[PDB]
RNA sequence: GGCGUAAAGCGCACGCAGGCGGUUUGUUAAGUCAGAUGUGAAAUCCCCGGGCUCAACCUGGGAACUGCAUCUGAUACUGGCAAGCUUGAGUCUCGUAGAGGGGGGUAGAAUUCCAGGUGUAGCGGUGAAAUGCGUAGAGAUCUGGAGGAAUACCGGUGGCGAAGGCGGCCCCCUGGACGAAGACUGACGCUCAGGUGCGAAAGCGUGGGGAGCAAACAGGAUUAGAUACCCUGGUAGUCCACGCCGUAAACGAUGUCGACUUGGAGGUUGUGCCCUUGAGGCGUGGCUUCCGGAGCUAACGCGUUAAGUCGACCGCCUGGGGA
RNA sequence: UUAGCUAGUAGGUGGGGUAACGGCUCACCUAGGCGACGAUCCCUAGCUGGUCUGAGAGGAUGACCAGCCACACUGGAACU
């Protein structure tokens, strides 16, 4: 059902980016904040706010160029049916280093560019292309 | 139940004890009359040769034409009416076989 | 399922108060009395395979509810199985 | 298509 | 890589094992990641060299051998334990709609049979005829009775059901669906190989039942022959009980569940508010058909009920024929 | 189109046994053991370091070199 909420998060982002929606909302969690805050610090989105404490509701502000999709495509990589893990030297790049790959490690959620100075590996979340 | 079956094939050749050959035939229920005109249908019967040129007109359908001497020969009894009713059945068969078209 | 006097009494039998109606042990008893109500019905009506689907729904629903109390608190599980006559 | 299907039986090479 | 039509979604449903799983905190450090040790024989391959006149070939050292074991670490995610939370999934009450199923009665047309009455030469049938029936009075009409099976109109891309399917009315037993207001349990969930049950009609076993329709068959036309077509009859079967058989173009030719993404013409079913100022106005859920944008698609077309973008799990297909 | 297999079989006591542990063997005691994570049965095959193909992942194979196991007309047995 909602068994991969990160894939449910990526579904709501990709639809509203293409359908010219100004802002979207979604149910919040601890992990969804730890991904959207990275995308805010990597120029893909604008802002995120939390609403509700017994029903945590996350909001995202979209981002356009002249009405053109900033996040062109995003690809869920690991999944509950098949887990994907890499080492500190097998971290894949997205568009030969243009896009970023969201990898969650023990030092928090960061990119593969940020994992070079960290020197760790773990679970690939999504290819932010 | 009331029909016949064609088991033996087209034609197998053998010889007589005296002389000549035999030719077997298939069980055939077909009638191919696409060959020639209905003037040749008049020539396809023996006793109807000697009665031609005796009717009223020089051309005659011999069914709906008044004064057909061939039809008078059937009414006389020298020609049986089983052959005459089958004769125009041949002519009415060419009204129903001819319908689509066929040519060699 | 049942009438108002039969439903609300069993909630007061197994629940702590009148508001304790959503708990699992009440939901077992709502299915336990209903299957015991339909014992003489399907004996006379073996050709009613459509109501048998509703019967097999409640048997499968009761089996799932007994597995939740068994995996969490076995003290309340062993009470209800003899209090309603289960485990056969 | 599902990876979990191929755990039970792999792809049948002719 | 695919499964609406090219080969392919089991006819459908339940459900064990198995896979997977909302959200918050603590803990474990299992999985994973970091570092280190030991090991992964040599030769081969790769890097830089040397040597044989050159090359092939031989050879130095390094790299590689993406492996495994152990130890020290990090705790974001997955797993286990512990305590939870409520939006998932459930429970109650008040209600509404429905050909949902089973059982038992009952109604009136129509068909055929039988009884009686009036009444006469054809009825019947077809493109045209014949078989057939009828002066023992058919047919037609009217009265009365018997039996059998089906429910006109209502009735409609209308409703219900997992599906095949389900239609006079009424009673009894009983199943699910949906809506309103709250209360309550606290992930109790999704999915399914074997397994289990349902499952159009034909057909089979046993015993009833018999109008009409009707395989085989009888008879008459048709015809080259008529076996079929057409017509007059007619058994099995169609009906019920008790089983069995489990296959269909069982089709929406689309497996189920969940999340989102511009919308219209309507239908059906509720509910909230409103000069009730009309069966209305304004909202708002459940179900359902036809259009159509973006997008997708081999095209046809799909297009908030996807065949759009995704996740969870299962089935199935690998040139045609053989099969 | 192989679903149940297995009585020295699974475990224990004691004796015997080998260079060493042990159903390795014997009497007794227990009825378990294995198996849908493929037991058992049938067919085929020496395996590996490697070679070859391939961008890679994979795929096919095991001659020469090297490592190990098995075998020495067939079958069985023991001595040294
Ligand atoms: N009583 C009887 N039977 C006969 C006579 N002649 C032939 N038959 C039978 O008729 C049947 C037909 O004979 P057959 O010669 O096979 O016929 P056909 O015409 O050759 N058949 P097809 O068309 O297959 O070749 C046979 O069973 C044969 O014995 C006869 O004079 N009397
Ligand atoms: Mg009800
Ligand atoms: Mg293809
Ligand atoms: Mg096809
Ligand atoms: Mg289906
Ligand atoms: Mg501590
Ligand atoms: Mg080596
Ligand atoms: Mg070396
Ligand atoms: Mg070398
Ligand atoms: Mg040189
Ligand atoms: Mg956890
Ligand atoms: Mg009647
Ligand atoms: Mg509570
Ligand atoms: Mg029979
Ligand atoms: Mg007939
Ligand atoms: Mg019968
Ligand atoms: Mg079939
Ligand atoms: Mg269609
Ligand atoms: Mg368009
Ligand atoms: Mg459309
Ligand atoms: Mg084939
Ligand atoms: Mg011993
Ligand atoms: Mg040699
Ligand atoms: Mg060797
Ligand atoms: Zn003439």
From Swiss-Prot, chain A:
GO terms for cellular component: cytoplasm; cytosol; cytosolic small ribosomal subunit. Pfam families: Ribosomal_S8. The keyword Transmembrane helix does not apply. The keyword Ion transport does not apply. Signal peptide: none annotated. Part of the 30S ribosomal subunit. Contacts proteins S5 and S12. Belongs to the universal ribosomal protein uS8 family. This is Small ribosomal subunit protein uS8. It comes from Escherichia coli (strain K12).
From Swiss-Prot, chain B:
Coiled coil: none annotated. Disruption phenotype: Reduced growth rate, reduced 70S ribosomes, accumulation of 17S rRNA (the precursor of 16S rRNA). Ribosomal proteins uS2 and bS21 not found in 30S subunits, decreased uS3 and RbfA in 30S subunits, distortion of rRNA helix 44 near the decoding center. The phenotype is partially suppressed by overexpression of a number of genes involved in ribosome function, including infB, era and ksgA. Double rbfA-rsgA deletion mutants have the same phenotype as single mutants. It is found in: Cytoplasm. Residues 78-104 are annotated as: Required to remove RbfA from mature 30S ribosomes. Transmembrane segments: none annotated. Changing residue 8 to A: Loss of GTPase activity, does not dissociate RbfA. Disulfide bonds: none annotated. Zn(2+) binds at residues 55, 60, 62, 68. It comes from the Bacteria. Residues 45-77 are annotated as: Required for binding to mature and immature 30S ribosomes. Belongs to the TRAFAC class YlqF/YawG GTPase family. RsgA subfamily. Has 3 domains; an N-terminal OB-like domain (about residues 1-100), a central, circularly permutated GTPase module (residues 104-270) and the C-terminal zinc-finger domain (residues 280 to 350). The C-terminal domain has 2 regions; the zinc-binding domain (residues 287-319) is required for binding to 30S ribosomes while the extreme C-terminus (residues 320-350) helps remove RbfA from the mature 30S subunit. This is Small ribosomal subunit biogenesis GTPase RsgA. It comes from Escherichia coli (strain K12). The gene is rsgA.
Curated annotation (Swiss-Prot), chain C:
Coiled coil: none annotated. Gene3D superfamilies: 6.10.250.3130, S15/NS1, RNA-binding. The keyword Cytoplasm does not apply. One of its GO terms (biological process) is translation. It comes from Escherichia coli (strain K12). Induction: Part of the metY operon that extends to pnp, also has its own promoter. One of its GO terms (cellular component) is cytosolic small ribosomal subunit. PROSITE patterns: RIBOSOMAL_S15 (PS00362). HAMAP family: Ribosomal_uS15_B. PANTHER family: RIBOSOMAL PROTEIN S15, BACTERIAL AND ORGANELLAR, SMALL RIBOSOMAL SUBUNIT PROTEIN US15M. The lineage of its organism: Bacteria, Pseudomonadati, Pseudomonadota, Gammaproteobacteria, Enterobacterales. Part of the 30S ribosomal subunit. Forms a bridge to the 50S subunit in the 70S ribosome, contacting the 23S rRNA. One of the primary rRNA binding proteins, it binds directly to 16S rRNA where it helps nucleate assembly of the platform of the 30S subunit by binding and bridging several RNA helices of the 16S rRNA. Binds to its own mRNA, stabilizing it 5-UTR and preventing its translation. This is Small ribosomal subunit protein uS15. Belongs to the universal ribosomal protein uS15 family. It comes from the Bacteria. Keywords: Ribonucleoprotein, Ribosomal protein, RNA-binding, rRNA-binding, Translation regulation. It holds the Pfam family Ribosomal_S15. GO terms for molecular function: rRNA binding; small ribosomal subunit rRNA binding; structural constituent of ribosome. InterPro entries: Ribosomal_uS15, Ribosomal_uS15_bac-type, uS15_NS1_RNA-bd_sf.
Curated annotation (Swiss-Prot), chain D:
It comes from the Bacteria. Belongs to the universal ribosomal protein uS12 family. With S4 and S5 plays an important role in translational accuracy. At least 19 substitutions or deletions in 11 codons can promote streptomycin resistance, dependence or pseudodependence; all but one of the streptomycin resistant mutations (K42R) are associated with hyperaccurate translation and thus reduced translational efficiency. Part of the 30S ribosomal subunit. Contacts proteins S8 and S17. Interacts with ArfA. May interact with IF1 in the 30S initiation complex. This is Small ribosomal subunit protein uS12. It comes from Escherichia coli (strain K12). The gene is rpsL.
């Amino acid at each position: 059902s909602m068994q991969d909420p990160i894939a449910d998060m990526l579904t709501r982002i990709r639809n509203g980016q293409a359908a010219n929606k100004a802002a979207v909302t979604m149910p919040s969690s601890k992990l969804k904040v730890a991904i959207a805050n990275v995308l805010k610090e990597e120029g893909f989105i604008e802002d995120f706010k939390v609403e509700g404490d017994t029903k945590p509701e996350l909001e995202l502000t979209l981002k356009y160029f002249q009405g053109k999709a900033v996040v062109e495509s995003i690809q869920r990589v690991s999944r509950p049916g098949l887990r994907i893990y890499k080492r500190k030297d097998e971290l894949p790049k997205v568009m030969a280093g243009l896009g970023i790959a969201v990898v969650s490690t023990s030092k928090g959620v960061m990119t593969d560019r940020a994992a070079r100075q960290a020197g760790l590996g773990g679970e690939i979340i999504c290819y932010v292309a | 139940s009331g029909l016949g079956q064609h088991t033996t094939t087209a034609a197998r050749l053998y010889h007589f004890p005296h002389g000549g050959d035999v030719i077997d035939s298939p069980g055939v229920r077909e009638f191919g009359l696409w060959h020639l005109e209905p003037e040749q249908i008049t020539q396809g019967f023996v006793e109807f040769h000697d009665y031609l040129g005796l009717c009223k007109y020089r051309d005659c359908k011999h069914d709906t034409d008044p004064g057909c001497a061939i039809r008078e020969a059937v009414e006389e009894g020298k020609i049986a009416e089983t052959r005459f009713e089958n004769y125009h059945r041949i002519l009415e068969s060419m009204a129903q076989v001819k319908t689509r078209k066929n040519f060699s | 399922s049942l009438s108002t006097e039969a439903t609300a009494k069993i909630v007061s039998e197994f629940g702590r108060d009148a508001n304790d109606t959503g708990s699992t042990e009440v939901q077992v008893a709502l299915l336990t009395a209903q299957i015991n109500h339909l014992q003489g019905h399907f004996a006379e009506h073996k050709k009613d395979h459509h109501s048998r689907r509703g019967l097999l729904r409640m048997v499968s629903q009761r089996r799932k509810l007994l597995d939740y109390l068994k995996r969490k608190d076995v003290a309340r599980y062993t009470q209800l199985i003899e209090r309603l006559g289960l485990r056969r | 298509a599902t990876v979990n299907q191929l755990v039970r039986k792999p792809r049948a090479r002719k």
